[PDB]
Amino acid sequence: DSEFNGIEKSCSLKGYGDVSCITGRGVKVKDSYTKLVGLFYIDTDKHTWQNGEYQIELELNFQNLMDEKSAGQDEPKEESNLG
Amino acid sequence: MEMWLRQAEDRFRFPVFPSSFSINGKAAVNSSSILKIGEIATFGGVALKSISISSFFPNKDYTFCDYTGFPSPYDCVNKIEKWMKEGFILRFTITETNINMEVIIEGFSYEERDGTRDVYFTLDLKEYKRIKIPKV
């Protein structure tokens, strides 16, 4: 079951961010038409400083759609009365 | 003032002195932009001078001509055209100024436009510099 491989979905993004967007971290991109958020993993990054402006270029790999509100709906498990 | 174009001992003097003459010179400047300070520039070298002449070759002995004994208009045209064709290195001088240098001909245009059979022309010249190859 490990050897199967499915369809690959990717994104190539250029925009403004901070120095925290580097290879090996997860990022979130919002879809404009449906207002849905998806989770991506960063595969390649590049930061440039020139002429007083700073831009980033990322190569993103799609993981899954972020669940509206909470997927498993984790609630803080507390007793009704503390004492 | 007089105007001469000479190729070794072969010399030609213009029969009608032009209404004006101008010399153009430029220098190259290299620009860079450094973060948070702005633009900077450095000297990069000087370019070659250029000069353009407009006048006519007369078909008769006028009162305002520089001298007497000049050739026919098309003789002058043929001589200058041959010089431009072979790419000769010539010497161009205007007396009573600081203009005395070696040049090469870039363009030559001539025309007739009235009932006098005079030939109007325009001549473009460019400064010439020889390259020095070092040896040991």
Resolution of this PDB entry, in A? 2.9
Longest dimension (CA), chain B: 69
**Which method was used?**
cryo-EM
Which residues from B are below 8 Å from A53, CB to CB?
Answer: none
Cβ distance A51 to B35 less than 8 Å, yes or no, reads: yes
What is the C-alpha separation between A25 and A39, in angstroms, rounded?
10
Token readout for B119 is 């030939």
The number of C-alpha atoms within 13 Å of B121 and in the hemisphere containing its C-beta is: 22
- Report the chain B residue with the minimal C-alpha distance to residue A49: B35
CA angle B58-B52-B64, nearest 5°?
A: 30
Which of B53, B72, B56, B54 has the alpha carbon at shortest distance from B64?
A: B56
From CA A56, how far away is CA A34, in angstroms rounded?
25
In this structure, chain A runs to a length of 83
> Contact at 8 Å (CB) between A56 and A17?
yes
Straight-line distance from the first to the last Cα atom of chain B, in angstroms, rounded to the nearest whole number: 46
Contact list, B33 vs chain A (CB under 8 Å): 51
Question: How many CB atoms lie under 10 A from the CB of residue B15?
Answer: 22
CA angle, residues B94, B95, B98, in degrees to nearest 5 = 70
